[PDB]
């Protein structure tokens, strides 16, 4: 079975790296220097490095040449045991379902639990249930 | 191919049968490639929001399903190369899942993730 290798990357750039790698593979697949990589895993919970699937280290070493993003993680290629080939795909509870409880960060109701009512298919705004906390304009000027 | 690769990161959905992650423009224009005759997705937007759901996490660069352990674990070996996911939360209504079994299409839950 193929092996899964690890390569360092920048913090906050994981989907961009994935799409760039996909574009590079699609653009250099009918040439004399194809890429032998099988697949790359970029979990959402992790942020700071990405994974890559390949048999030998030379494959990914020669496959990440020229890219300016993976330059940092180029002089070291760590190998993980075979037991870690199934925990990476695990996800602990996406996270968008009506009639569920969610919390807020900005606004005035900071660090408070709320409840979802309706979701707009436009993916721009979403309703929310919460009890008001204002003073009803009696203390403020 | 260049038609399955996502164009813009913003506004991206994912299917529930084969977990095909692409951009909304491609879904409206091209639609589900691995399952089109049995889904009838090309040429409309309502069905896209009906079946596909944006509630999904995880991205994988599938390129050789025939020779890959991840494809075997996810049961996507008989699909075309593309950008898939590992956990798509959702369930089709009780009006489209019925005809899939009648036409010889096994409906399985791709939400491999655990709950609590
Ligand atoms: Zn699908």
From Swiss-Prot, chain A:
Top-level division of the source organism's lineage: Eukaryota
Q: Where in the cell is it found?
A: Nucleus
- Expression across tissues: Ubiquitously expressed.
Chain ranges of the KOW domain: 96-129
So where does this one cross the membrane? Answer: none
So what does mutating residue 74 to A actually do?
A: Reduces the affinity for Pol II elongation complex
Interaction with SUPT4H1, as annotated region? 1-93
Q: How is it modified after translation?
A: Methylated by PRMT1/HRMT1L2 and PRMT5/SKB1. Methylation negatively regulates interaction with P-TEFb and RNA polymerase II. Phosphorylated by CDK7 and CDK9. Phosphorylation by P-TEFb (CDK9) at Thr residues of the C-terminal repeats alleviates transcriptional pausing and promotes transcription elongation. Dephosphorylated by the INTAC complex when transcripts are unfavorably configured for transcriptional elongation, leading to premature transcription termination: dephosphorylation is mediated by the PPP2CA component of the INTAC complex. Dephosphorylated by the PNUTS-PP1 complex in termination zones downstream of poly(A) sites, thereby promoting deceleration of RNA polymerase II transcription.
Which residues constitute the signal peptide according to the record?
none
This protein's assembly is summarised as: Interacts with SUPT4H1 to form DSIF. DSIF interacts with the positive transcription elongation factor b complex (P-TEFb complex), which is composed of CDK9 and cyclin-T (CCNT1 or CCNT2). DSIF interacts with RNA polymerase II (Pol II); forms DNA and RNA clamps that stabilize Pol II elongation complex while maintaining the nontemplate DNA strand in the transcription bubble and nascent RNA in the exit channel. This interaction is reduced by phosphorylation of the C-terminal domain (CTD) of POLR2A by P-TEFb.
Entry function? Component of the DRB sensitivity-inducing factor complex (DSIF complex), which regulates mRNA processing and transcription elongation by RNA polymerase II. DSIF positively regulates mRNA capping by stimulating the mRNA guanylyltransferase activity of RNGTT/CAP1A. DSIF also acts cooperatively with the negative elongation factor complex (NELF complex) to enhance transcriptional pausing at sites proximal to the promoter. Transcriptional pausing may facilitate the assembly of an elongation competent RNA polymerase II complex.
What family, per the record? Belongs to the SPT5 family.
Task: Please give the name of this protein.
Answer: Transcription elongation factor SPT5
Q: Which organism is it from?
A: Homo sapiens (Human)
UniProtKB/Swiss-Prot annotation, chain B:
Keywords of the record: Acetylation, Activator, Metal-binding, Nucleus, Repressor, Transcription, Transcription regulation, Ubl conjugation, Zinc, Zinc-finger
List the GO biological process terms: negative regulation of DNA-templated transcription, elongation; negative regulation of transcription by RNA polymerase II; negative regulation of transcription elongation by RNA polymerase II; positive regulation of DNA-templated transcription, elongation; positive regulation of transcription by RNA polymerase II; regulation of DNA-templated transcription; regulation of transcription elongation by RNA polymerase II; transcription elongation by RNA polymerase II
Residue ranges, annotated region (Interaction with SUPT5H): 1-39
Keyword Acetylation annotated: yes
Extract the Pfam families matched here: Spt4
**Domain of life of the organism encoding this protein:** Eukaryota
Tissue distribution of the protein: Widely expressed.
Q: What is its main location?
A: nucleus
The entry's localization annotation reads: Nucleus
Is this entry keyworded Repeat? no
Q: What does this protein do?
A: Component of the DRB sensitivity-inducing factor complex (DSIF complex), which regulates mRNA processing and transcription elongation by RNA polymerase II. DSIF positively regulates mRNA capping by stimulating the mRNA guanylyltransferase activity of RNGTT/CAP1A. DSIF also acts cooperatively with the negative elongation factor complex (NELF complex) to enhance transcriptional pausing at sites proximal to the promoter. Transcriptional pausing may facilitate the assembly of an elongation competent RNA polymerase II complex.
What is the protein name given in its UniProt record? Transcription elongation factor SPT4
The protein's organism comes out as: Homo sapiens
Gene behind this chain? SUPT4H1
């Amino acid at each position: 079975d193929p092996n899964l290798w690890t390569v360092k990357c920048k913090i906050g750039e994981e989907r961009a790296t994935a799409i760039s790698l996909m574009r590079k593979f699609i653009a250099y697949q009918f040439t004399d220097t194809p890429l032998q990589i099988k697949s790359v895993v970029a979990p959402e919970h992790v942020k700071g490095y990405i994974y890559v699937e390949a048999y030998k280290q030379t494959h990914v070493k020669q496959a990440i040449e020229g890219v300016g993003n993976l330059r940092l993680g180029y002089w070291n290629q760590q190998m993980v045991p075979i037991k870690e080939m199934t925990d990476v795909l695990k996800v602990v509870k996406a996270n968008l379902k009506p009639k569920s409880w969610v919390r807020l960060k900005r606004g005035i109701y900071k660090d408070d639990i709320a409840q979802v009512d309706y979701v707009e298919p436009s993916q721009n705004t979403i309703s929310l249930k919460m009890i008001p906390r204002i003073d009803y304009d009696r203390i403020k000027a | 191919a260049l038609e399955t690769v996502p164009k813009d990161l913003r506004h991206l959905r994912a299917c529930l049968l084969c977990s095909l992650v692409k951009t909304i423009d491609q879904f409206e224009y091209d639609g589900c490639d691995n399952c089109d005759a049995y889904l009838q997705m090309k040429g409309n937007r309502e069905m896209v929001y009906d079946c596909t759901s944006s509630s999904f996490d995880g991205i994988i660069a599938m390129m050789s399903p025939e020779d890959s352990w991840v494809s075997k674990w996810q049961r996507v070996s008989n699909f075309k190369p593309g950008v898939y996911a590992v956990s798509v939360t959702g369930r089709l209504p009780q009006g489209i899942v019925r005809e899939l079994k009648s036409r010889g299409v096994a409906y399985k839950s791709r939400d491999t993730a655990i709950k609590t």
